[PDB]
Amino acid sequence: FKNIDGYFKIYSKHTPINLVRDLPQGFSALEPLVDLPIGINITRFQTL
Amino acid sequence: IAWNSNNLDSKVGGNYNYLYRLFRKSNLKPFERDISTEIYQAGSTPCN
Amino acid sequence: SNIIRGWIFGTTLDSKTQSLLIVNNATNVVIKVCEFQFCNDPFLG
Ligand SMILES: *[C@@H]1O[C@H](CO)[C@@H](O[C@@H]2O[C@H](CO)[C@@H](O)[C@H](O)[C@H]2NC(C)=O)[C@H](O)[C@H]1NC(C)=O
Ligand SMILES: *[C@@H]1O[C@H](CO)[C@@H](O[C@@H]2O[C@H](CO)[C@@H](O)[C@H](O)[C@H]2NC(C)=O)[C@H](O)[C@H]1NC(C)=O
Helix, strand or coil: CEEECCEEEEEECCCCCCCCCCCCCCCCCCEEEEEEECCCCCCEEEEC | CCCCCHHHHCCCCCCCCCCCCCCCCCCCCCCCCCCCCCCCCCCCCCCC | CCCCCEEEEECCCECCCCEEEEEECCCCEEEEEECCECCCCCCCC
C-alpha cells in the first residue's frame, strides 16, 4: 500500500503454501492491482 | 483551462453559493482535498 | 478460512475527517471514501 500525490496504490500477489507458523522464505514479485484517486491524508490504519 | 463566467455565476443580489478555505494549520499536499469544517484556532485559549 | 476481510485507512477515524474503507463482505468488494464514525472495535460476523 502506497499513498503518493493523491493516489492510493495497491500491489498484490497470491501464493499456495503448506506451513503452520512463521512467514516463509522465497521470492515473488507483486503486480499492480489498482490506483485509487482518493485525495486524503492517511496516517493510521486498522485491520478488519 | 479557464474562462470568465460572469453571466452564469453572478446574481444581482449577490451569489454566495461558492466557497474557499481561508485558514489551515499547514499547507496542502498535491491533489489532496480538504472538506473539514473545524473552527480554526488562531491563538491560545482553545475554542471548544 | 478467510478471516482477514479488509482495512480502514485514515487520520482520526472519527467523522471529523475523511477515511477510506476497503471491505470484502460475503458478496461484494466495497471501496468507499467518506466521513465515518468507525466503531472502537470493528469486525464482521
Ligand atoms: C496529515 O495529518 C497528520 C495527522 O493529523 C498531520 O500531522 C500532524 O500535524 C499536527 C500539526 O498540524 C501536529 O501537531 C501533529 O503532531 C502531527 N501528527 C503527525 C502524526 O504527523 C499532518 O500535518 C497532515 N498533513 C497535511 C498536509 O495536512
Ligand atoms: C455487500 O455490500 C454490497 C454493497 O454495499 C451490498 O449490496 C447492496 O445491498 C443493498 C441491500 O439489498 C442493495 O439495496 C444495494 O443495491 C446493493 N448494492 C449493489 C448490489 O451494488 C451487499 O448486499 C452486501 N452483502 C452482504 C452479504 O451484506
